[PDB]
Amino acid sequence: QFNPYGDNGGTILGIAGEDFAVLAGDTRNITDYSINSRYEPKVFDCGDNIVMSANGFAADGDALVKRFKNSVKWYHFDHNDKKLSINSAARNIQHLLYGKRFFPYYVHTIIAGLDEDGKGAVYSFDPVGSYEREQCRAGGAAASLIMPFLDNQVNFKNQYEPGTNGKVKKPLKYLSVEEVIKLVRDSFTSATERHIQVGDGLEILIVTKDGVRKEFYELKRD
Amino acid sequence: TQQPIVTGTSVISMKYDNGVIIAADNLGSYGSLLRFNGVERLIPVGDNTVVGISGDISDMQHIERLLKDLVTENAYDNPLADAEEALEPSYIFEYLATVMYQRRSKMNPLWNAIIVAGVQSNGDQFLRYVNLLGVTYSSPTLATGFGAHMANPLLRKVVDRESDIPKTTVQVAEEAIVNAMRVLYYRDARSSRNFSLAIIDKNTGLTFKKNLQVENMKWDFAKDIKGYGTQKI
Amino acid sequence: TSIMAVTFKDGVILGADSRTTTGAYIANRVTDKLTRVHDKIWCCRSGSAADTQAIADIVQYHLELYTSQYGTPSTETAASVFKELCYENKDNLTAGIIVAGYDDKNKGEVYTIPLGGSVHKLPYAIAGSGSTFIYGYCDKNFRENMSKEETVDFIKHSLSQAIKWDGSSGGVIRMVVLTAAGVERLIFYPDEYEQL
Amino acid sequence: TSIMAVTFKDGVILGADSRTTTGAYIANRVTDKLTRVHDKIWCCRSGSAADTQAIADIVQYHLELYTSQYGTPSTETAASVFKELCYENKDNLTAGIIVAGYDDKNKGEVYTIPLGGSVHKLPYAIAGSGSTFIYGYCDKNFRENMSKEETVDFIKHSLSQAIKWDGSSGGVIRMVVLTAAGVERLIFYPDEYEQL
Amino acid sequence: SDPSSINGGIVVAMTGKDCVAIACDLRLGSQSLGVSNKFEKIFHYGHVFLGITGLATDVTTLNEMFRYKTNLYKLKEERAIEPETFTQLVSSSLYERRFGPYFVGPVVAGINSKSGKPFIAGFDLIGCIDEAKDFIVSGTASDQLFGMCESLYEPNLEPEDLFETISQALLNAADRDALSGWGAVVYIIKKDEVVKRYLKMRQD
Amino acid sequence: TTIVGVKFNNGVVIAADTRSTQGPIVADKNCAKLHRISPKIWCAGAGTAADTEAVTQLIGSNIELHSLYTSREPRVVSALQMLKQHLFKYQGHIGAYLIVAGVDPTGSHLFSIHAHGSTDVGYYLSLGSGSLAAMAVLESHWKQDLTKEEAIKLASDAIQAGIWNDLGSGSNVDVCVMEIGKDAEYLRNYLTPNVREEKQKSYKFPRGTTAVLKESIVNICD
Amino acid sequence: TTTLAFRFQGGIIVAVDSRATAGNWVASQTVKKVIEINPFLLGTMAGGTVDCQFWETWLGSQCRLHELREKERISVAAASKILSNLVYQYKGAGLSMGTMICGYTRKEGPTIYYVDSDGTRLKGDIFCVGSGQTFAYGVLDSNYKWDLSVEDALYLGKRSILAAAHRDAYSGGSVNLYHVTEDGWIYHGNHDVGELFWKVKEEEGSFNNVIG
Amino acid sequence: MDIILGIRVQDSVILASSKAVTRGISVLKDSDDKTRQLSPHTLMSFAGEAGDTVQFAEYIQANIQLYSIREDYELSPQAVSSFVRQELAKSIRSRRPYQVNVLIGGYDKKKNKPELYQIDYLGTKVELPYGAHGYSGFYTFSLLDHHYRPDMTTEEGLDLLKLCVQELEKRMPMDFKGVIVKIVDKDGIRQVDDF
Amino acid sequence: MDIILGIRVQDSVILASSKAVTRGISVLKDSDDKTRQLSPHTLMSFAGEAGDTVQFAEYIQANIQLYSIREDYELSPQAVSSFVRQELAKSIRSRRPYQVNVLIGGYDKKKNKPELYQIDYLGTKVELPYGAHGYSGFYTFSLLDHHYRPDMTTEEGLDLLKLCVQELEKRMPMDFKGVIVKIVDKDGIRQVDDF
Ligand SMILES: *[C@@](C)(CO)[C@](*)(O)[C@H](Cc1ccccc1)NC(=O)[C@H](Cc1ccc(OC)cc1)NC(=O)[C@H](C)NC(=O)CN1CCOCC1
Ligand SMILES: *[C@@](C)(CO)[C@](*)(O)[C@H](Cc1ccccc1)NC(=O)[C@H](Cc1ccc(OC)cc1)NC(=O)[C@H](C)NC(=O)CN1CCOCC1
Numbered sequence A: 001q002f003n004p005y006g007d008n009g010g011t012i013l014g015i016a017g018e019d020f021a022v023l024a025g026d027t028r029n030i031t032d033y034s035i036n037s038r039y040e041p042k043v044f045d046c047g048d049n050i051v052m053s054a055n056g057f058a059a060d061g062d063a064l065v066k067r068f069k070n071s072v073k074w075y076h077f078d079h080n081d082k083k084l085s086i087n088s089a090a091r092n093i094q095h096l097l098y099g100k101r102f103f104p105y106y107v108h109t110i111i112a113g114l115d116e117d118g119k120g121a122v123y124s125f126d127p128v129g130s131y132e133r134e135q136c137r138a139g140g141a142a143a144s145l146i147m148p149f150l151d152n153q154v155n156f157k158n159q160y161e162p163g164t165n166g167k168v169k170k171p172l173k174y175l176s177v178e179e180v181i182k183l184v185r186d187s188f189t190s191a192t193e194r195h196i197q198v199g200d201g202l203e204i205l206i207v208t209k210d211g212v213r214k215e216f217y218e219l220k221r222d
Numbered sequence B: 001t002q003q004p005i006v007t008g009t010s011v012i013s014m015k016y017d018n019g020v021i022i023a024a025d026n027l028g029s030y031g032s033l034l035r036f037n038g039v040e041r042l043i044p045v046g047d048n049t050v051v052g053i054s055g056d057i058s059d060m061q062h063i064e065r066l067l068k069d070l071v072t073e074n075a076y077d078n079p080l081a082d083a084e085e086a087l088e089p090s091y092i093f094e095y096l097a098t099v100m101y102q103r104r105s106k107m108n109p110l111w112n113a114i115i116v117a118g119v120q121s122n123g124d125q126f127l128r129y130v131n132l133l134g135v136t137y138s139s140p141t142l143a144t145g146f147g148a149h150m151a152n153p154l155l156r157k158v159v160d161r162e163s164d165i166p167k168t169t170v171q172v173a174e175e176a177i178v179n180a181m182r183v184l185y186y187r188d189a190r191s192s193r194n195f196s197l198a199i200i201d202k203n204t205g206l207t208f209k210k211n212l213q214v215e216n217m218k219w220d221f222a223k224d225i226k227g228y229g230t231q232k233i
Numbered sequence C, D: 001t002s003i004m005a006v007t008f009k010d011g012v013i014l015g016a017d018s019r020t021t022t023g024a025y026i027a028n029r030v031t032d033k034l035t036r037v038h039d040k041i042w043c044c045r046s047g048s049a050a051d052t053q054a055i056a057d058i059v060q061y062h063l064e065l066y067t068s069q070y071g072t073p074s075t076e077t078a079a080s081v082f083k084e085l086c087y088e089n090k091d092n093l094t095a096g097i098i099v100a101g102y103d104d105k106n107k108g109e110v111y112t113i114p115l116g117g118s119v120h121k122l123p124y125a126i127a128g129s130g131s132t133f134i135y136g137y138c139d140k141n142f143r144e145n146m147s148k149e150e151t152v153d154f155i156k157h158s159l160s161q162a163i164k165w166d167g168s169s170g171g172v173i174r175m176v177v178l179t180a181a182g183v184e185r186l187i188f189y190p191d192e193y194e195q196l
Numbered sequence E: 001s002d003p004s005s006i007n008g009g010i011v012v013a014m015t016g017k018d019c020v021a022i023a024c025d026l027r028l029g030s031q032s033l034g035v036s037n038k039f040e041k042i043f044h045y046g047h048v049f050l051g052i053t054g055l056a057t058d059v060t061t062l063n064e065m066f067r068y069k070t071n072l073y074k075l076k077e078e079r080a081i082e083p084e085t086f087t088q089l090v091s092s093s094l095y096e097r098r099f100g101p102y103f104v105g106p107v108v109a110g111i112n113s114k115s116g117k118p119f120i121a122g123f124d125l126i127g128c129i130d131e132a133k134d135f136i137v138s139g140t141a142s143d144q145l146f147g148m149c150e151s152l153y154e155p156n157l158e159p160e161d162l163f164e165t166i167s168q169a170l171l172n173a174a175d176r177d178a179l180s181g182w183g184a185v186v187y188i189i190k191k192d193e194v195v196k197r198y199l200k201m202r203q204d
Numbered sequence F: 001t002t003i004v005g006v007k008f009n010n011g012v013v014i015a016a017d018t019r020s021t022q023g024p025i026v027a028d029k030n031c032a033k034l035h036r037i038s039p040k041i042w043c044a045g046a047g048t049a050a051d052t053e054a055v056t057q058l059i060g061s062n063i064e065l066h067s068l069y070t071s072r073e074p075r076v077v078s079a080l081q082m083l084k085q086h087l088f089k090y091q092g093h094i095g096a097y098l099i100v101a102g103v104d105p106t107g108s109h110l111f112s113i114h115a116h117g118s119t120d121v122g123y124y125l126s127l128g129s130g131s132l133a134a135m136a137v138l139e140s141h142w143k144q145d146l147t148k149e150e151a152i153k154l155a156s157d158a159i160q161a162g163i164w165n166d167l168g169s170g171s172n173v174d175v176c177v178m179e180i181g182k183d184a185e186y187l188r189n190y191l192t193p194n195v196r197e198e199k200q201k202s203y204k205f206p207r208g209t210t211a212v213l214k215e216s217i218v219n220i221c222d
Numbered sequence G: 001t002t003t004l005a006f007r008f009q010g011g012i013i014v015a016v017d018s019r020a021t022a023g024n025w026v027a028s029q030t031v032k033k034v035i036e037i038n039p040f041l042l043g044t045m046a047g048g049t050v051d052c053q054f055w056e057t058w059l060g061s062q063c064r065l066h067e068l069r070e071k072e073r074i075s076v077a078a079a080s081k082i083l084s085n086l087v088y089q090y091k092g093a094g095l096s097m098g099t100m101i102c103g104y105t106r107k108e109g110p111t112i113y114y115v116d117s118d119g120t121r122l123k124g125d126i127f128c129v130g131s132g133q134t135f136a137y138g139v140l141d142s143n144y145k146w147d148l149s150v151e152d153a154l155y156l157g158k159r160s161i162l163a164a165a166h167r168d169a170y171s172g173g174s175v176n177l178y179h180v181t182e183d184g185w186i187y188h189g190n191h192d193v194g195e196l197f198w199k200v201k202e203e204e205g206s207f208n209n210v211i212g
Numbered sequence H, I: 001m002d003i004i005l006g007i008r009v010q011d012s013v014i015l016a017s018s019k020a021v022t023r024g025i026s027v028l029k030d031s032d033d034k035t036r037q038l039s040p041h042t043l044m045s046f047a048g049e050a051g052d053t054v055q056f057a058e059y060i061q062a063n064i065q066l067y068s069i070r071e072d073y074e075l076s077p078q079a080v081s082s083f084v085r086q087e088l089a090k091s092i093r094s095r096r097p098y099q100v101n102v103l104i105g106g107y108d109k110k111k112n113k114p115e116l117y118q119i120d121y122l123g124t125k126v127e128l129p130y131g132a133h134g135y136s137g138f139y140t141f142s143l144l145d146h147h148y149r150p151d152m153t154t155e156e157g158l159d160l161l162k163l164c165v166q167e168l169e170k171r172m173p174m175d176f177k178g179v180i181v182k183i184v185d186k187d188g189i190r191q192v193d194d195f
């Protein structure tokens, strides 16, 4: 019997700072035990300072990104070139995903950008459209490896102030773009070590008020 | 929901400094029966694109007709049909990719793996893959079926990343492709000795080679092999 | 597999391709499917590689022990031991074996043993997946009391066609000639047989 | 079924056995598997009797309507209409059809259409369950530009073997000769072909 | 009805400078229902420490079985079993039940008393030895532990620093797994002293 | 796994990668797939990891007892016969796929065994998930009358093909050279082309970060 | 999930946990499971995240359209019935929802309606919904009286979620409290179970099963 | 079968076990005692598959009684629980396993301490302050987490137990026809007749 | 849902319907009224699949109320029952059928007679002196066969009904949390508050 779904592997990661946000993803694309491409980007600039990635089944991922990019285009036509806010983009994506509730897009979607107060924003979706704004989210094959590390290093979970008898928590603070990229690079190199579907290359899209910048880093190719 | 009947095996391809090479054998398998031997699985579109197709042959022939019809439709009310408004490889691919994904979404797929090789109008090499699931990807080397498992490893030794493309000549690239075709004949049970090869160069254009054969094969060492272990005779 | 054994004037010749498959992948392209169970009793193996191998080894053991006590066994005796294993373990075996041997009294003999474990003595036998494509050809072309050169051509042309149509068959054509003179191994490469 | 169509010097000949089965029972031993879709365009039917029949009737209707408007259709056109039906309804059809016709410009032509609904133009074609047993024989014996008598012998000997080995094939060997001269029906009975 | 994830639990082991650490959570549940918050998964036979995750009845059974075997070993050999030897004993015993296995994920940890070398090892349910310089992970949050250990770990950590690394590896891995947590225990093992610490963690 | 075996002038060489997987997770990044049956008979194993180790040890044990009994150096065909009869008896349920090689008084030998108990003979062989990547290289570059240094190069190249192109294979290349008249040399980590890059950050925690409820000294003595 | 809402002397308490799960993987610890439909209307979420999230915000759009058309805030009964009639149209399609529509109006007073994806719609004083509902019921029932103070009722709702958060593996994260009065709903904060458990243990002397 | 509870307090272990025996759409009996005295200071309640439960309980009872006679000595609750666990741990890999869950309440006379052990059909043993098998735990555990204190009296334990039964009678789907309560302490085993 | 009973006596129809709403291992509600007034002298109780029951009951209610307003006239119980049966008879061959069983108790004012109709989800209608749906019938029918007389009063009918509820409470596996009883007679529909 024909199976309409497949698993193209890879993993993605979104972190939000005070005045910026990053959306990272490895460039490896796979089926079963074969590598299809060592450089196939799945993190995209969608306009209006919104970066997006839909990781899982690449055919569904590309279809969704394509539809959202188109959604942004028509939002401009219909509402006098108004900038689509990240919260509005998030809600719009929920409707795109839920539109196929009974034949889902097999993808974990993450978008990043800046909210209307200029502060960093990351939104994450399940395959059928449930969404939630967060400081931190890993998605895809190696999400289970990376996410607990992010809880510990971004949100300082399980970390207490030394000498306070485990009574005072380590205080939350925004990380610099330099510190965030360090965590992203370490997250992906660690994921590459222990997950077979993750590797080849890492592409990070950084979003500030000035626009969207890119950074690329080599990953292990085994 | 389908099952493929008459099938075509590996399509292999790679980029080199000035263009792209693509190849596929001339066999139409009917399960284990090697039924048809005159099957052309590389289909040129204009003088700048070749579409290589594996999988179901009835669906391949349908895709042939679509591409043929696409050329006709593009020529309508188009004075620049043989110039600026000619069909690009990227246009041909996106059209097929759209069709493939729409068909999978209707649970009635075209049971194929497709590689669109060509050269764009600005001289850029185009090489992209699409299959029955609508899954698309691009790489310096692309291959379908057994080619993905056996050809890609060999072709990646020549062009392992982007920077290796300018350093690869058409002589070196074709040699690797022809070698890969031999390896597939040794090891793929649904491959044939006869194959076609196409080169799309940004300078010399489209060169379509038919009725090629796998040659310089190593079989002599077989005479020394006896039994499966202890047998001495 | 495509395998066959053919009796002729001076004795019998066994023939086989050299392809072993795991799905559509060729695990071994230079396989030796013609195996010695006794000096001048050989067999062609089709079906499960592991099953036919385990059987042939047990038979070789049985015939070696037979020889130690009662001297050279007949080809019929060898076929009977094959049958006994294949029949009694029919539920756990996928083995299609052709048994061929040379006596001085009985000359060349061929016994085929299909899946069920039945025994059939024939002038010539064909077996394996690729045999289906040459029933027509072999029936039309086989003659009794052929010469060595004619029988070699008959097997070569037959397996050439079997190989051409069957995807599960290919590589080299191995042959084993069983006569009073002794045992002769023959090999034929693609470049020769493909263009017949 | 065993069916085949063979091009030759003067045109093309279609050939078929006459056995129809429902399991191992022969429902009809004198079946006519060679059917007219146009004056000099005929087809051999294999697979489901009901499916191939319903298709051939629709094609005959299409070509009759084609002729009313645009004159005699080409053999390629007839094959295209067969393909269109077989391909678009592949999920609901079990039909293996060989299309054969005579033009004056194109002479004899043979198109085979397997289960998938693909089209393949060939010098000669074989199909049906019994065709498996004669791939070896037909490949070795076919020559281009044969005479009428040679082509009749080629088909007769081929189907004779197909019938001999395939249980799903038998009865009489029907043939239909398509040339400039016209349309000739031939029949050959067991007592003749069995002892070839 | 997947034996290895009915009760839940995790074990992690690490090496440091002239020391080893082995840690486990305390949960024992029946699928969603948490039943016990006192179920320790780490045992020891002399100076060799064994942590076992998986089906809790087998955890208990194997502990009792290895206590049995190491006691007889000591009586006959007149010495304590070493980690390398015990690792082989575990492997043998698990493979003995090849086609009816204990649904467990054992982890050996300890310092060889003769050479002084820190030693850790992991196994699958069927006996395959997984030796490592750095760390071994096991349990329902093994993916999480792999990700934590692979990033947090560095070689030649002092006992006091190693404690912090392994504890943070376990805690943050446990909090991303529904079936792990409900308390934790860490063993710091030096050549001739062993410290056992209970960690404060979230109880959900 | 990816494992290969290559015959040469005066002996035989086998090689293997060093990745062990559990689904998509890399369990062991440097496991040993090359197994000693006897001093000059070595085995490369793919398939179920415990099965390859257990079956190689059992036959290795029985080979040693046999060698002592007969006062002879063991032969590769004896190991081959004992392995295949054991594997056949278990009808494939012991999932061991082995490349058996070695030198003995009879000469140098190279065989492969499948889980169901079938054996092959060859000058070059490859087994495991990356066997197609390896065999592609072997078929391209193998020739009759290889030297020792050529065979090691060919073997390790075939393993590398698996390491890079197969997701079930990775990390390092182990090699074992068995030459006639000489001791077999086991080259553990012959190549190490997958060294982890320096991490961006040290995650050494300030002492006291972890909250503690209880402390106690554990008694390991009698 | 564990969600509850109960009626009492001083109005309605609504309490929920904040955990999301995908099998045994803890997907989130900070999820909002209460949706503020309007200043006098709340909706709780249990079951499939999106099914609840999508259709309850849609419910809010339908309630807004009612007060535009009718110039009057929608009744809790009518609001719950829009949602129940919607999911009933999808009955069998595989929607997964366990919701509670809580609110105050003049004609009804404080009202709670249980609505689930197989079409059940029930008015009632006390409901607990979710995988940890039974754990919440245990504590809630055994301590519930109609005459509870606003202070005590808030605590009982908070304590009942904590009870479930502790025992149920698929419940946890943090507690979100709400109090619904005649004047509308009032938010009573997010309470992390990480700190709340130990604080409750110490002060209350409960949770003796746990190693202190 | 269905509901079996257990609460260990300061000086005793209290076991409550439902009285209903249901088979199909009929409650065949409403006065069933789902317990066996293993020794003078050890009581075992049980729930699970029909037939298996009593067969297993009585088999254990016979073995412990055999031990008592042979050694003229009472096994400790810990020793009895370990014996029982091993029997279930054997059972689970048998041709047909005992599908029986048990609670073992005992008073250790050497330690002067009450002890409660919860053992499921897999042979999963845990010592607990309070225990339950089946769906009962899904209500009682959270309730006991709240109200239980380690220094309670037997009377306080019974009131705590009444609170559990009331909650079960309110929220459980099936009518389990109340419970038989038994107390295990320094003076042995006795039954509360009015509950 | 689960237990719905009906008894027709000399001058009235008495409907008893269980109060429990259970879902999983939790009794979500113990005061549920499984009935709708279709017209002043016609009452319909219902039991079956969750959601379907109330949706169907209210749909019928709306239609009968629509008829009443249109004609300024009350449909006879027989006419209402036939309408209901046809709706279920349509339903059973739909894409998704209503899985609802109903009892229709009514007082025909033209005949001055009480009438009780039992209709299952297939659309199988029968007029009866006493009726039940689900497993309830397996106890009550044999009990009513014995104790029922056609000339009983409403008070005698209620005592007869108490006997049925007592038997169900004794032998039924599930706790159905008692019943809401309603009487239909010449003066319309009223609820008995103390049962
Ligand atoms: C041709 C290739 C196909 O029938 C021959 O029969 C050939 C005979 C042969 C090959 C090598 C040595 C001596 C004789 N058979 C095979 O190559 C055989 C194909 C086959 C496999 C399984 C069968 O049923 C049990 C029947 C035919 N190939 C193998 O045995 C290979 C080595 N192993 C596998 O394919 C693994 N199998 C094991 C059995 O269970 C399924 C997976
Ligand atoms: C040979 C006999 C076997 O393939 C031919 O293909 C022959 C072709 C033929 C026969 C008569 C007229 C024209 C052409 N085919 C049959 O005889 C055919 C066998 C067949 C049946 C069903 C198939 O799949 C649907 C494929 C092949 N026989 C029939 O159709 C007979 C008349 N009917 C049945 O067997 C009843 N079938 C109907 C289809 O569903 C199964 C039961």
Ligand SMILES: *[C@@](C)(CO)[C@](*)(O)[C@H](Cc1ccccc1)NC(=O)[C@H](Cc1ccc(OC)cc1)NC(=O)[C@H](C)NC(=O)CN1CCOCC1
Binding pocket: E124, E125, E126, E128, F001, F002, F019, F020, F021, F022, F023, F027, F031, F032, F033, F045, F046, F047, F048, F049, F050, F052, F053, F095, F128, F129, F168, F169
């Ligand atoms: C490559 C990595 C395959 O991906 C090799 O075949 C490798 C061989 C190897 C590894 C270490 C030492 C010697 C040889 N195989 C594995 O690493 C193997 C892959 C595998 C997993 C599951 C299988 O199930 C049929 C078969 C192969 N991994 C393991 O054996 C791991 C350590 N163990 C398990 O996954 C436990 N399984 C074993 C089979 O029984 C069920 C539980």
Ligand SMILES: *[C@@](C)(CO)[C@](*)(O)[C@H](Cc1ccccc1)NC(=O)[C@H](Cc1ccc(OC)cc1)NC(=O)[C@H](C)NC(=O)CN1CCOCC1
Binding pocket: A126, A127, A128, A130, G001, G002, G019, G020, G021, G022, G023, G027, G031, G032, G033, G045, G046, G047, G048, G049, G050, G052, G053, G096, G130, G131, G170, G171
């Ligand atoms: C607790 C955590 C137990 O699950 C709650 O029921 C919780 C409710 C909730 C409500 C609003 C916001 C967050 C959380 N439920 C979940 O977290 C839910 C569990 C669940 C999964 C699948 C279901 O389908 C039968 C039903 C319940 N988890 C999710 O919805 C997660 C985030 N998403 C997925 O698992 C994605 N699936 C959903 C179903 O369709 C396929 C994709």
Ligand SMILES: [Mg+2]
Binding pocket: A221, A222, F162, F163, F164, F165, F166, F167, F168, F169, F170
């Ligand atoms: Mg790799």
Ligand SMILES: [Mg+2]
Binding pocket: D048, D050, D051, D092, D093, D094
């Ligand atoms: Mg049909």
Ligand SMILES: [Mg+2]
Binding pocket: D163, D164, D165, D166, D167, D168, D169, D170
């Ligand atoms: Mg016949």
Ligand SMILES: [Mg+2]
Binding pocket: E203, E204, G164, G165, G166, G167, G168, G169, G170, G171, G172
């Ligand atoms: Mg919890």
